[PDB]
Design an enzyme around this catalytic site. Structure first.
Site, PDB file in Angstrom:
ATOM      1  N   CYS B  72      62.796  67.254 106.510  1.00  0.00           N
ATOM      2  CA  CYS B  72      63.308  68.474 107.093  1.00  0.00           C
ATOM      3  C   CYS B  72      63.815  68.224 108.516  1.00  0.00           C
ATOM      4  O   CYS B  72      63.299  67.388 109.248  1.00  0.00           O
ATOM      5  CB  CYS B  72      62.219  69.539 107.133  1.00  0.00           C
ATOM      6  SG  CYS B  72      62.800  71.220 107.558  1.00  0.00           S
ATOM      7  N   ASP B  74      63.357  70.253 110.878  1.00  0.00           N
ATOM      8  CA  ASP B  74      62.375  70.794 111.800  1.00  0.00           C
ATOM      9  C   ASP B  74      62.031  69.818 112.907  1.00  0.00           C
ATOM     10  O   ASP B  74      61.763  68.649 112.684  1.00  0.00           O
ATOM     11  CB  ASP B  74      61.100  71.088 110.997  1.00  0.00           C
ATOM     12  CG  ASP B  74      60.134  71.976 111.734  1.00  0.00           C
ATOM     13  OD1 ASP B  74      59.504  71.548 112.724  1.00  0.00           O
ATOM     14  OD2 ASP B  74      60.016  73.135 111.305  1.00  0.00           O
ATOM     15  N   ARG B  76      59.575  69.416 114.618  1.00  0.00           N
ATOM     16  CA  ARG B  76      58.203  68.938 114.730  1.00  0.00           C
ATOM     17  C   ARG B  76      57.931  67.772 113.808  1.00  0.00           C
ATOM     18  O   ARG B  76      56.802  67.254 113.793  1.00  0.00           O
ATOM     19  CB  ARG B  76      57.183  70.044 114.425  1.00  0.00           C
ATOM     20  CG  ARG B  76      57.330  71.214 115.379  1.00  0.00           C
ATOM     21  CD  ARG B  76      56.604  72.455 114.897  1.00  0.00           C
ATOM     22  NE  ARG B  76      57.258  73.011 113.710  1.00  0.00           N
ATOM     23  CZ  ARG B  76      56.846  74.075 113.022  1.00  0.00           C
ATOM     24  NH1 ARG B  76      55.754  74.727 113.351  1.00  0.00           N
ATOM     25  NH2 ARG B  76      57.523  74.495 111.961  1.00  0.00           N
ATOM     26  N   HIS B 128      56.685  69.604 104.903  1.00  0.00           N
ATOM     27  CA  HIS B 128      55.738  69.788 105.986  1.00  0.00           C
ATOM     28  C   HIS B 128      55.253  71.223 106.028  1.00  0.00           C
ATOM     29  O   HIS B 128      55.983  72.154 105.644  1.00  0.00           O
ATOM     30  CB  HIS B 128      56.403  69.342 107.322  1.00  0.00           C
ATOM     31  CG  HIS B 128      57.441  70.305 107.742  1.00  0.00           C
ATOM     32  ND1 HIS B 128      57.166  71.384 108.578  1.00  0.00           N
ATOM     33  CD2 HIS B 128      58.718  70.452 107.399  1.00  0.00           C
ATOM     34  CE1 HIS B 128      58.241  72.113 108.757  1.00  0.00           C
ATOM     35  NE2 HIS B 128      59.241  71.571 108.041  1.00  0.00           N
ATOM     36  N   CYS B 131      57.084  75.136 107.209  1.00  0.00           N
ATOM     37  CA  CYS B 131      58.524  74.967 106.969  1.00  0.00           C
ATOM     38  C   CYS B 131      59.214  76.307 106.891  1.00  0.00           C
ATOM     39  O   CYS B 131      58.963  77.094 106.001  1.00  0.00           O
ATOM     40  CB  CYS B 131      58.768  74.161 105.683  1.00  0.00           C
ATOM     41  SG  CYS B 131      60.516  73.727 105.451  1.00  0.00           S
TER      42      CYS B 131
HETATM   43 ZN    ZN Z   1      60.961  72.530 107.391  1.00  0.00          ZN
END
Ligand code: ZN
Ligand code: CL
Ligand code: CL
Ligand code: ZN
Lengths: 229, 229
Positions: B72, B74, B76, B128, B131
């Protein structure tokens, strides 16, 4: 008592604890290379959670990165590492040769989500020296015989438009600039800029960067655009 | 002489050198947040090239990662950081909610290139916790009103197929497994497996992992497939 600490327990060794923790993984038992990367993670996790738990609990709550990185899949260009950032700082798209294709609905969705929901302010397209897609594109005729060559069609066409004498790094740089233009021309950015001009939305900016593998330095190509000139 | 070192030169301070180095960047002069990330890079670059130049010169020559990470966007979940890897170790695709859509020609091209040219052996789809695409998908009706919702259609449809009582993390896990199936069913993997069975190509494997933001740990979902059962 038999000495001063005759019943004191020692923790199990970290390696033993990690081995047991990875017992859940079938593949870790089968592939040493998989066990290795999972061990890497478990040592990292043990260290961050014992030395920065505040930071890990902040990351559970959400994310508010100010940047979107549109970069290459190349293993030598991990964005957080080469900018010495942390988890939470950079929203990322990575694909082959850092293209932002207007017709790619998944890329358009990512950009729209980044701007409208995640809240990023700066979008950086980041190319890099030694880019395999660009190296491949540099010697292809104009069109496609493999998935890769078909995929690289826009970079091939760009190469064929560059002046005599252009080298591989010239193509890599121009490929960055091409992607920046495609990001700028997106409905997302065009919409965000009009709203900013109206005072209905923050200004958002698009930049073009080049990561030089020979020095570890990021160079700004100075093609930044925003809502105003 | 006026003392023992009356003419000894001191280097310029690193901060001064970096400021001058970033003079090339228009945007660094305009945005403190851009100057910050570029400074981050320049300190990193100065450190690695003075303490590991061998490693930087090896990276100039090429790349031979054993892994492809399909993860992803993302912020993080930076793969090299959370696995405590180095540049050169992990080829990466990152998109919203770590989808591998069969109809996405750019994703198919990346996978084919990874396997046929880059030489990866292991493909990990990594989801993760937290999400956003999955959290959004979890409450949508079956279809699409925004680019995001249209993009998330396969995850929405998966959610609607999961049993009563499934929670967000159940959807995130099932979304990983769905992407693994799409990777496995790709012409690239199906082709690579048939060639391996023929002894004409190495075995390549597809795995499904979950990054738990609450602990920093990667958990193996145990959905690995290879050319043989
Ligand atoms: Zn995600
Ligand atoms: Cl423009
Ligand atoms: Cl199968
Ligand atoms: Zn590249």
């Amino acid at each position: 008592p038999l000495g001063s600490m005759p019943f004191h327990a020692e923790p199990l060794k970290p390696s033993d604890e990690i081995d047991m923790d990875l017992g859940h993984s079938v593949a870790a038992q089968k592939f040493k290379e998989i066990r290795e990367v999972l061990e890497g993670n478990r040592y990292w996790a043990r260290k961050v959670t014992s030395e920065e738990p505040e930071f890990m609990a902040e990351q559970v709550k959400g994310q508010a990165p100010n940047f979107l990185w549109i970069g290459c899949a190349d293993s030598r260009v991990p964005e957080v590492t080469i900018m010495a950032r942390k988890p939470g700082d950079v929203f990322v798209q990575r694909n082959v040769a850092n293209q932002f294709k207007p017709e790619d609905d998944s890329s358009q969705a990512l950009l729209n989500y980044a701007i409208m929901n995640v809240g990023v302010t700066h979008v950086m397209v980041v190319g890099h020296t030694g880019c395999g897609g660009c190296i491949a594109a540099f010697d292809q005729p104009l069109p496609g015989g493999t998935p890769l060559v078909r995929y690289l069609e826009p970079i091939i066409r760009l190469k064929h438009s560059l002046p005599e004498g252009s080298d591989v790094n010239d193509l890599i740089k121009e490929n960055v600039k091409m992607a920046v233009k495609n990001v700028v021309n997106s409905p997302t950015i065009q919409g965000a800029w009009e709203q900013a001009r109206k005072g209905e939305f923050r200004e958002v900016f698009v930049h073009g960067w080049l990561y030089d593998l020979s020095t570890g330095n990021i160079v700004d190509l100075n093609v930044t655009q925003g809502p105003h000139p």
